[PDB]
């Protein structure tokens, strides 16, 4: 139909998506969004919807979770990051479900990644691989694992949650998670264990 | 492999019992006031939308009453029972709404079944409707297969009303395609003109694009001032625009104007000894031998027919059963004039060996052909419906005949045997006795030219010719074909170039077969040498080969590589 009708449909869909992302998915109708997505892709306008999706998702991430992580980099930095990841995942589940139907036609003809993969990629680019968050996360994980290696016990379930989050963030395998985690931790383990062996050769014997 | 089937049936029928007897229903579908008590399990197995509806965490996850809108009760009921009993009763009418709800509910299995139903139901009267349906919902496989059948059929009919209600993108793809089958490039021009003039100025913006896909041989001649008559008043952005616009876009002839009158041959002698037989063709104009696709599963002992719409069909035949070994099958196939392949169609009711395929009133008639029955009606004459894609029995012929030929003259079926002839009247479904021949000859072929029947040859064969007149109802002799003595000519009657020509291959003693065709003078009763087929291009074909008149595209077909 006319461009005004599709623009109004997209505007309403964008408002509904933002409302869902604001932890207000209770009072919102699913059938209307599916029908709106039905008539949007029907008119061969999936490119605009996909482009609008990416802009909305990245704007929400930069506004909400980018500020939240930087505001609490010292007060439960890992706990807040995991909570934001869980909020992103649980919001994407409904976001993906509506747009997986859009994906079924879109990715099989346009040959692009799915919306769930798109959300993981943009989350990786804007949160984990940030110019400041990446180094801060790397430094804090090395510090706590070194303190754990020193002899005192710290939280261990959160570390398992963090590596699992990064493993899912890889989205293809162990490409991003391995390089990001191992390379600083391999070097940290290398120096720590080298000093440990050097200390042991003079303070003890081979018995 | 699979798992225990005996429990697979038990659980299936018990779920059906729990569905018809409404007991374990936690979710009910509310559609236009109709109650549909069912389960979340069964809706999940079929549909991929209910998996985003229940296991999603929305308000409907806990709600036990959902108001499913934009659906149909009958379509939902058949989909639900298909998820419950698997019996997908697909008729010829409700498949359109069946696909609509299947795509809405994202039910993959029923989507494939109805697509398989629509891939078989694609025909003349619904080609435009199915293509628009295939354009609305992304069904590329159906869309492409329709487009091919659509491309040939629009050119033939170009008068269906649904052609006017088509999207601009679809029309551009149809018109700019190089698969159109037209004797002239002007019929597509007027088809676009009537489509543009069908509606108001809403076609004006699309006119700058539709002419950009048509060749420029018609973008400077007539049908330019006609649009100026239909132009919106005072519009100076179109008349001048088209004045200086038709410079580019590389005038090039289309592919539909590349059909030539050719002699299609089947069951020819295979060049490579690995295969039994092959199919070739002779070009009376190009003087070359183009190869053809092998018969479906090397279907031997078949019959050919070419409709006035220039369509090739194959019926009957036998396949070597999995040393002599052959089993007769009633499979039916249709030849694609462009893809060089045989598309399967609705099979017959009885198997046939060497059936006489004759087209009349759009129906394909297969008379006799050594049926498997062998009962008192050992003829089994049956026609084929080209619009409904089904076979219907006709009036049985009076006398059982073997090794017979049939032609169509004056909208009637004329079948010929050793000495008798019976004419079938399709309007009343009856047989009437015809004239009796004075010579006992069989194993011959006849060609229908105008209002006369020319029974050429008969028994090897000979040069005996008996001409029969429909208006006169009498058999008369004309002449004998002058051929070399002490030979065994293989006569083949056919109509070509609005004249009665003969494809006669003769073999001398201790000599190879020679190919030569003659033109029979109708008024002078004499066979004149029209053309001599050189052996450098055409090799031996055999004895059980058939010939028919038809048109084919040399571009789609490929030349057969074989030594002279």
Curated annotation (Swiss-Prot), chain A:
Domain of life per record: Eukaryota
Posttranslational mods: Neddylated. Attachment of NEDD8 is required for the E3 ubiquitin-protein ligase activity of the BCR complex. Deneddylated via its interaction with the COP9 signalosome (CSN) complex.
Coiled-coil annotated spans: none
Tissue distribution of the protein: Brain, spermatozoa, and testis (at protein level). Widely expressed.
Intracellular or extracellular location(s): Nucleus; Golgi apparatus; Cell projection, Cilium, Flagellum; Cytoplasm, Cytoskeleton, Spindle
Note: High-glucose conditions in renal tubular epithelial cells lead to up-regulation of CUL3 expression, significant increase in CUL3-mediated ubiquitination of MRPL12 and dysregulation of mitochondrial biosynthesis.
Subunit structure: Forms neddylation-dependent homodimers. Component of multiple BCR (BTB-CUL3-RBX1) E3 ubiquitin-protein ligase complexes formed of CUL3, RBX1 and a variable BTB domain-containing protein acting as both, adapter to cullin and substrate recognition subunit. The BCR complex may be active as a heterodimeric complex, in which NEDD8, covalently attached to one CUL3 molecule, binds to the C-terminus of a second CUL3 molecule. Interacts with RBX1, RNF7, CYCE and TIP120A/CAND1. Part of the BCR(SPOP) containing SPOP, and of BCR containing homodimeric SPOPL or the heterodimer formed by SPOP and SPOPL.
Family: Belongs to the cullin family.
Known function: Core component of multiple cullin-RING-based BCR (BTB-CUL3-RBX1) E3 ubiquitin-protein ligase complexes which mediate the ubiquitination and subsequent proteasomal degradation of target proteins. BCR complexes and ARIH1 collaborate in tandem to mediate ubiquitination of target proteins. As a scaffold protein may contribute to catalysis through positioning of the substrate and the ubiquitin-conjugating enzyme.
Disorder cited: Pseudohypoaldosteronism 2E: An autosomal dominant disorder characterized by severe hypertension, hyperkalemia, hyperchloremia, hyperchloremic metabolic acidosis, and correction of physiologic abnormalities by thiazide diuretics. Neurodevelopmental disorder with or without autism or seizures: An autosomal dominant disorder manifesting in infancy and characterized by global developmental delay, variably impaired intellectual development, and speech delay. Some patients have seizures, others have autistic features or behavioral abnormalities. Additional variable features include cardiac defects, failure to thrive, or brain imaging anomalies.
Name this protein carries in UniProt: Cullin-3
Organism of origin: Homo sapiens
Lineage: Eukaryota, Metazoa, Chordata, Craniata, Vertebrata
Residue span relative to the full protein: 25 to 231 of 768
Curated annotation (Swiss-Prot), chain B:
Modified-residue entries (Phosphoserine), positions: 294
Swiss-Prot/TrEMBL domain comment: Recognizes the BCR (BTB-CUL3-RBX1) E3 ubiquitin ligase complex substrate, PIK3R1, through the 4 tandem C-terminal Kelch domains.
Gene: KBTBD2
Biological source species: Homo sapiens (Human)
Presence of keyword Repeat: yes
Molecular-function GO terms, alphabetical: ubiquitin-like ligase-substrate adaptor activity
Entry function: Substrate-specific adapter of a BCR (BTB-CUL3-RBX1) E3 ubiquitin ligase complex that acts as a regulator of the insulin signaling pathway, modulating insulin sensitivity by limiting PIK3R1/p85alpha abundance in adipocytes. Targets PIK3R1, the regulatory subunit of phosphatidylinositol 3-kinase (PI3K), for 'Lys-48'-linked polyubiquitination and proteasome-mediated degradation.
Kelch repeats: 311-362, 363-411, 413-451, 452-495, 501-547
Hydrolase found in the keyword field: no
Paired cysteines (S-S): none
Stored InterPro entries: BACK, BTB-kelch_protein, BTB/POZ_dom, BTB_POZ_KBTBD2, KBTBD2_BACK, Kelch-typ_b-propeller, Kelch_1, SKP1/BTB/POZ_sf
Protein name: Kelch repeat and BTB domain-containing protein 2
UniProt KW keywords: Kelch repeat, Phosphoprotein, Repeat, Ubl conjugation pathway
């Amino acid at each position: 139909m006319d461009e005004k009708y599709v623009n109004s449909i997209w505007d309403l869909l964008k408002n509904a998506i933002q409302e869902i992302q604001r932890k207000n998915n209770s009072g919102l109708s699913f059938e209307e969004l599916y029908r709106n997505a039905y008539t949007m892709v029907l008119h061969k306008h999936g490119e605009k919807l996909y482009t609008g999706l990416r802009e909305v998702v990245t704007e929400h991430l930069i506004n909400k979770v980018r500020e939240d992580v930087l505001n609490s980099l010292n007060n439960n930095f890992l706990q807040t990051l995991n909570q934001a990841w869980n909020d992103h995942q649980t919001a994407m589940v409904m976001i993906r479900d509506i747009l997986m139907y859009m994906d079924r036609v879109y990715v099989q003809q346009n040959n692009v990644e799915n919306v769930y993969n798109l959300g993981l990629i943009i989350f990786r680019d804007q949160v984990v691989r940030y110019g400041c968050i990446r180094d801060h996360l790397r430094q804090t994980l090395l510090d706590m694992i070194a303190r754990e290696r020193k002899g005192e016990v710290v939280d261990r379930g959160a570390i398992r949650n963090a590596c699992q989050m990064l493993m899912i963030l890889g989205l293809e395998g162990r490409s991003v998670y391995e390089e990001d985690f191992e390379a600083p931790f391999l070097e940290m383990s290398a120096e720590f264990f080298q000093m440990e062996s050097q200390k042991f050769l003079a303070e003890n014997s081979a018995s | 492999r699979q798992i225990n089937t005996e429990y697979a049936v038990s659980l299936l029928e018990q779920l059906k019992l729990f569905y018809e007897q409404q007991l374990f229903t936690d979710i009910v579908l509310i559609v236009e006031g109709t109650e549909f008590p069912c389960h979340k399990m069964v809706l999940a197995t079929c549909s991929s939308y209910f998996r985003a509806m229940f296991m999603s965490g929305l308000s409907e996850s806990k709600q036990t009453h959902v108001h499913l809108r934009n659906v149909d009760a009958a379509t939902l009921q058949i989909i639900i029972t298909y998820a419950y009993t698997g019996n997908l009763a697909m008729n010829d009418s409700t498949v359109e709404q069946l696909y609509e709800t299947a795509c809405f509910l994202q039910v993959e299995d029923v989507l494939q079944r109805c697509r398989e139903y629509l891939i078989k139901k694609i025909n003349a009267e619904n080609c435009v409707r199915l293509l628009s349906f295939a354009d609305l919902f992304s069904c590329e496989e159906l869309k492409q297969s329709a487009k091919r059948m659509v491309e040939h059929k629009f050119t033939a009919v170009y008068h269906q009303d649904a052609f006017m209600q088509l999207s601009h993108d679809l029309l551009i793809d149809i018109l700019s395609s190089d698969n159109l089958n037209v004797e002239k490039e002007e019929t597509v021009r007027e088809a676009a003109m009537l489509w543009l003039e069908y509606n108001t100025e809403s076609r004006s913006q699309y006119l700058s694009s539709v002419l950009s896909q048509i060749r420029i041989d018609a973008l400077s001649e007539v049908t330019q001032r006609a649009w100026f008559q239909g132009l919106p008043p005072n519009d100076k952005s179109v008349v001048v625009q088209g004045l200086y616009k038709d410079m580019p876009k590389f005038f090039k002839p289309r592919l539909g104007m590349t059909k030539e009158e050719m002699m299609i041959f089947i069951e020819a002698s295979s060049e490579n000894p690995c295969s039994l037989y092959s199919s070739v063709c002779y070009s009376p104009q190009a003087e070359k031998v183009y190869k053809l696709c092998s018969p479906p599963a090397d279907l031997h002992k078949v019959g050919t027919v070419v409709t006035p719409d220039n369509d090739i069909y194959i019926a009957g035949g036998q396949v070597p059963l999995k040393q002599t070994a052959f089993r007769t099958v009633n499979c039916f196939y249709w030849f694609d004039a462009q893809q060089n392949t045989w598309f399967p169609k609705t099979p017959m009711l009885f198997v046939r060996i060497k059936p006489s395929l004759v087209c009349c009133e759009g129906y394909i008639y297969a008379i006799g052909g050594d049926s498997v029955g062998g009962e008192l009606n050992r003829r089994t004459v049956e026609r084929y419906d080209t619009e409904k894609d089904e076979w219907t029995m006709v009036s049985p012929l009076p006398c059982a005949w073997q090794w017979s030929a049939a032609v169509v003259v004056h909208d009637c079926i004329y079948v010929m045997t050793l000495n008798l002839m019976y004419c079938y009247f399709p309007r009343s479904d009856s047989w009437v006795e015809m004239a009796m021949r004075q010579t006992s000859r069989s194993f011959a072929s006849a060609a229908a030219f105008g209002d006369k029947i020319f029974y050429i040859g008969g028994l090897g064969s000979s040069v005996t010719v008996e001409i029969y007149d429909v208006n006169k109802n009498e058999w008369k002799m004309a002449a004998n074909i002058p051929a070399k003595r002490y030979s065994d000519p293989c006569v083949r009657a056919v109509v070509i170039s609005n004249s009665l020509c003969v494809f006669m291959r003769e073999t001398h003693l201790n000599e190879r077969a020679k190919y030569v065709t003659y033109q029979y003078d109708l008024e002078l009763d004499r066979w004149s040498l029209r053309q001599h087929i050189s052996e450098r291009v055409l090799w031996d074909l055999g004895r059980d080969f058939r010939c028919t008149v038809g048109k084919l595209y040399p571009s789609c077909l490929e030349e057969s590589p074989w030594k002279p």
